[model samples]
Target: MQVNRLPFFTNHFFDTYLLISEDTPVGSSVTQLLARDMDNDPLVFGVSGEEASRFFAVEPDTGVVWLRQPLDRETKSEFTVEFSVSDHQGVITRKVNIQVGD
Candidate 1:
């Protein structure tokens, strides 16, 4: 048998937001999301949107998001990144807003 070592963070909807500067440096993490799992079940993380990765890079398994490049407040101010989680049995999607400013 397998042991989880710890319980999941949440079973309900999980949500969070990220704020970034238009001049944010590249190759830096903008935000990180926990890939919570229950019963120690394996999970997969992903984002859904047009050229989603152009805005940020969501590392697989860990669920940590990183800045792909400098942000552009003029080209795009904000976007809703929809991340999906699957424990093999089911999949759920959640959204977190990424707002840009100075």
Candidate 2:
């Protein structure tokens, strides 16, 4: 016998916009993804986008997002990242937009 519930994000949608300095250091935390499962199921987090990983990374167990590369406002100033949370039953996704500035 088993019970299960789909994991859900704390908010209906996590789509957001952020502004940060181009000088933000590599390995700095960018943001965190949050979700809950009624069955107490363990949730695994994943991240991806068009070359999303070239600039960012996500901690699978904790859903903490980190910067993987340096940002230069003059070269590139915007980014879109996709993140997902999954439980036994299914998965859900969200998008984030980051703007780089001086």
Candidate 3:
């Protein structure tokens, strides 16, 4: 049998800045994080940031991002979301800062 190696990231950062409208509806899909892997193995994803859990969720296997709750620009104007992707080998990390505008 052959051995597989851990996956690595292509870049240090990917479009780290994003823009969103304050009027974005609840239960709506915000964005998706697409991470490339070295082994072509299935990848798991994670998100980290303030109010991260209360605001976002990702589909395992697909890396599809979802909005878990309503967004209020007045309450929170910006989000610094850090993402992690991993295969059997290891994890690749990245971050995106989202700006909420009216």
Candidate 4:
């Protein structure tokens, strides 16, 4: 699994946009897992930060994971996003850092 870097612009508010590929294999699942400390019981914020790992499964033969709403630009520089895949052999994850104003 690979975490594709998304190109986005940031300002002073929490507004973000992501570019997703439309060629992912059908029936495949994608999940966004987040962690702050990356060690010692790192918190996992799936869809929302407050929940204990929230996720929304995609339909069969779908290759797009669109963000219902944009993310805050202010938080884009500090926050990190990752992609995880679920298969027969457990789950595999990858990390992609969002760099803003560079």
Candidate 5:
């Protein structure tokens, strides 16, 4: 028999920061969230939170974060996002802050 373990993040941090121009085009690459499972299971990535759900998306297979809407520093200068990586056994989530630049 084999034991299962929760997915763990590799090359990731509890706090992630990103900066980009407000004028940056939509659908642009923002950043990537990374993780791995020690039990050799497949992983799925996701994003949540009010701002994140409205403005951004994460690729399920690649963990690549993408901007889904326009950004404006005046309207909203900062965004807080929650990212998750899930395997067969469990899931891990992290917070990310994105600062909009002029």
Candidate 6:
């Protein structure tokens, strides 16, 4: 999995992208995507595979995923997001860096 930064506006919108690939023939699925606070706690904001389809226009068959949410400027700071993906065989995990700044 790969993470990419997206343009974010202070007190406005926040967005980012995650790219997933399969090396072996395994029917993998993204179970959960989450945003973590600086203290390593999970934030309230998040989206699932189904919900992501509407926001990111990602097809269910595609491995690429995108997530976005309205960010509060007051809570803007360095954060970490934990992404969890699973397959019939096992689980694949990744993390993303989020910097909310002016």
Model 1 sits at a Cα RMSD from the real structure of 4.5
Question: Residue 36, candidate 2: how far off, in angstroms?
Answer: 1.5
Tens digits of per-residue lDDT for model 4, 1-102? 953332221222223433232333434343233223222221222222321122223222222333433334454433344444333223334444433332
Model 1 worst lDDT window (10 residues): 4-13
Model 4: which residue pairs collide?
Answer: 14-71, 14-72, 15-71, 15-72, 15-73, 16-71
Q: Would you list the clashing residue pairs of candidate 1?
A: none
Question: Ranking under TM-score, best-scoring first?
Answer: 5, 2, 3, 1, 4, 6
Query: Which lDDT values do the candidates have, in the order given?
Result: 0.69, 0.80, 0.74, 0.32, 0.81, 0.34
Q: Which prediction has more favorable lDDT, 2 or 3?
A: 2
Worst 10-residue lDDT window, candidate 4? 5-14
Model 2 TM-score, 2 decimals: 0.81
Task: Per model, state how many residue pairs clash.
Answer: 0, 0, 1, 6, 0, 0
TM-score of each: 0.73, 0.81, 0.80, 0.33, 0.85, 0.32
Task: Find the 10 residues in a row with the least total lDDT in model 3.
Answer: 7-16
RMSD of 4: 13.8
User: What are the clashing pairs of model 2?
Assistant: none
- Which segments of candidate 6 are over 4 A away from where they belong? 1-68
How do the residues 1-102 of candidate 5 rate in per-residue lDDT, one tens digit apiece? 868888866644455567878998999987777786777788999887786788888889998878899999999998777788999567787776778999
* Model 3 alpha-carbon drift over 4 Å, by segment: 1-13
Q: Could you say which candidate leads in lDDT?
A: 5
The C-alpha stretches of model 2 lying farther than 4 A from their native spots are: 1-3, 11-13
lDDT value, candidate 6, whole model: 0.34
